[PDB]
Design a protein around this ligand. Structure first.
Ligand SMILES: NCCc1c[nH]cn1
Ligand SMILES: NCCc1c[nH]cn1
Ligand SMILES: NCCc1c[nH]cn1
Length: 144
């Protein structure tokens, strides 16, 4: 599917629709933290950087919060020591990225119940291949 190919721009991915945030829906990693999320704010076109707040649900059921910076480097999203490479993004509803050998499907907070771009499911399935997927978004609080 032509429009599912070549959608690898990290800056577009970081920004999304510039409101809400993204939840990690599925990952090839086992033991991932439930309700892992990221949320970009204060998008700077000059530098292709954004403030990035991220975390996950702690033992008591509240979201953790750490704030740093996301920097676009071509296909790559860099936050601190961590780099993720964009496999597919629509800049609106979802992304597929690779981080540290793992394949991840991220979904915008507006689309947690489904109805995001099919290219995300296609590219997630393709990229993970035979590595099983693990669900991460379960009984999550709303997006900070
Ligand atoms: N919309 C980009 C979501 C993401 C995944 N990894 C880091 N950020
Ligand atoms: N490459 C961005 C990895 C990440 C996800 N969440 C926080 N950092
Ligand atoms: N491991 C912290 C960064 C990250 C990547 N994917 C999810 N979170």
């Amino acid at each position: 599917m032509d429009d599912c190919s070549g959608k690898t721009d990290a800056w577009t991915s970081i920004k999304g629709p510039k409101t809400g945030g993204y939840w990690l829906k599925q990952t090839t990693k086992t033991g991932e933290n439930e309700c892992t999320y990221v949320k970009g704010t204060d998008f700077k076109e000059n530098t292709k950087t954004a403030t990035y707040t991220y975390g996950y649900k702690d033992a008591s059921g509240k979201l953790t919060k750490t704030t740093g910076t996301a920097t676009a480097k071509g296909s790559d999203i860099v936050v601190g020591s961590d780099t993720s490479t964009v496999i597919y993004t629509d800049g609106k509803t979802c992304d597929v990225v690779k981080h540290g050998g793992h394949t991840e499907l991220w979904v915008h907070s507006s689309k947690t119940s489904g109805g995001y771009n099919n290219c995300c499911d296609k590219k997630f399935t393709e990229t993970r291949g035979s590595t099983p997927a693990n669900e991460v978004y379960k009984k999550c609080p709303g997006m900070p």
